[PDB]
Structures are given as structure tokens and as C-alpha cells.
Write an enzyme that holds these catalytic residues in place. Sequence first.
Site, mmCIF file in Angstrom:
data_model
loop_
_atom_site.group_PDB
_atom_site.id
_atom_site.type_symbol
_atom_site.label_atom_id
_atom_site.label_comp_id
_atom_site.label_asym_id
_atom_site.label_seq_id
_atom_site.Cartn_x
_atom_site.Cartn_y
_atom_site.Cartn_z
ATOM 1 C CG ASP A 35 -1.051 15.908 -11.129
ATOM 2 O OD1 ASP A 35 -1.210 16.997 -11.716
ATOM 3 O OD2 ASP A 35 -1.875 14.953 -11.163
ATOM 4 C CB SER A 199 -4.894 33.701 -18.862
ATOM 5 O OG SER A 199 -4.136 34.393 -19.835
#
Length: 330
Positions: A35, A199
Site C-alpha cells: 500500500d 498530473s
Amino acid sequence: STGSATTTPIDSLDDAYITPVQIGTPAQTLNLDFDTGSSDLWVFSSETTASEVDGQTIYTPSKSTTAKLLSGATWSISYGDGSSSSGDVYTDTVSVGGLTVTGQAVESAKKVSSSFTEDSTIDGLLGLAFSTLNTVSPTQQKTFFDNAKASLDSPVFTADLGYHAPGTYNFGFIDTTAYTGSITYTAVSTKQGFWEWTSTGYAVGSGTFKSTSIDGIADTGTTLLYLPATVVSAYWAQVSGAKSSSSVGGYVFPCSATLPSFTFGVGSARIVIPGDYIDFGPISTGSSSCFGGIQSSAGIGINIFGDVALKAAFVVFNGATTPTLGFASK
């Protein structure tokens, strides 16, 4: 040193991925959910409330000659999906794919929430976010990667998650045969303890690319792709009959649909998520309404590049003094 381990979807939907981890002496192999959005290595154990164990493999520290109770240490964690767990702490030898750390904090669960009990395939979590998020008290502990880093050939790990198929986590090296083209690296902020990056934009299907900054985290422990409501609406508007359902808890779409791809930007580079990766199947058994793999982050407080996004790429988690993230197509 290096390590390399195969990671395997837990079910036919790729709801999560499990990776075998050796703990203790002799080894006890548990299948852990790696994770990159959390920083605790915790396991089902011989100390876990019996009624809360249902099919998981447990760690029994009393059977490990290298286990030592970390005196006074406790841990307690709550995840973004509302699940939680807590317990005490041992140090022990932990190996992943041939890479060994001695003295790793292994957090033994005394209590786990229902969602963990109900998932027989996940024996615990192995956190790969920054150690500043580790919940051990009163002395915070380091992640497996943090402990291994100085020994690694290069201070990196890579995630290569499969679509409906196994993939790989590598530690300490970049497998240049595992991706196509080049790896594009992008800046990381560690201020919130996550692999947080920006992004450069998105496209829906064969549509034009929209240049827009989208801050979010690379999180292998989250199933879906969570993005701003504007972006998500633009995606689902291209699927006939798709709608946001408050009762179901997100966007649903007719199972008869053909889903468009979704592209996200990494610098000037582009990662394409095929439409099929965005199908999470019937909302309930036998339903013709299917659950979408791109959902709104509104009310999470952060955008999450979860498995839906990451499995479309070869992803480098670069733990150099100034961390960065790399993405390649594959």
C-alpha cells in the site's frame, strides 16, 4: 541488494493485489496488500480477536526465534475507506522477494474492522508511503522500504500491476524489459506523507487532451481512480446511460456498454487506461448495472491515482534524497 516478488489480484475484478512476505524464523509467509498510501506493516496474528479472524493466515510471534516485543509500542490506523485496525508491535526479520530486513516493525493486530475480517485473502498490509505516516506510538517506526533503502542497489521500488493478471513489485532496480518507451519522471511532494504528484491533464477516449494540473497520490492500496468531479463527469458523459447514483455510492453504467479509454498526463507523456480497466462489474450479483472504475474525489479531499490508473503503467517510486515518481507505458 534487490528483491522481486509477484503480486496477484485477489479476485476477478482486481479489487486489490496480494504479495507474499516472509516474516520471522522459520519463515511464516503471509499475503500482504502493498500500500503506497500508508506506512504501517500490520498483520493478522495469534493476538487477533478470534471472532475477527475468518480464513486469514496469521503471524504467531511466539513461534519466531527472531521476534522481539517492542516494549510499550501500540498502533492504530484508520483508512480512507473507513476500515481500521490496531494492536501491539514486534520487531522481526521480514523478506520480500529475496530482500531481507532485520529488525522490521511488524504490527500485530489485536483488533480489525469488519471489512478486513470479511476478506479472507488479505493477511495484512505492507505500507510503502513515507515513514512520517507510521502510526506506532510512542516511537514511530520505519517502513520496510525505508529500512531496506541504504542496502538497495538503487533507492527505488517499482509497481507493475497486472490487469486481470499477476504483476511485480521490484526493490532496488529498474527492470528495463518491463516497459515500453521511456520512463517520465515527475516531482513529488512528501508534505502529506504520500507519493503526491501533479498530473498534467487528461483525455476521454479519442478526445482532445485537456491540459490542467491535477494534484493526487499514487496509491497502490486504493482500487479505483478518484478525480475531480468535472473530470469524472466528462468521462461518464461519453457512456450512454451512465449516471451518478447516490444510493449505490458513485457512477454506474449499463453493463452492455463499451467503455472509452481514459488518458492521464505525466509531464509531456501520456498513460492510456483502456476502457475495460474501468469496468468493475455488476453492482450486485445478477444486476445489469455495473460499477465504474473512475469516481469523484469530491469529499475525499484528495485525488487518488489508485490501481485502475497505476496498472496501466510501469511505476517507479524513487526514494532518492529528493523523491520523484516515474511512469512508463507497458
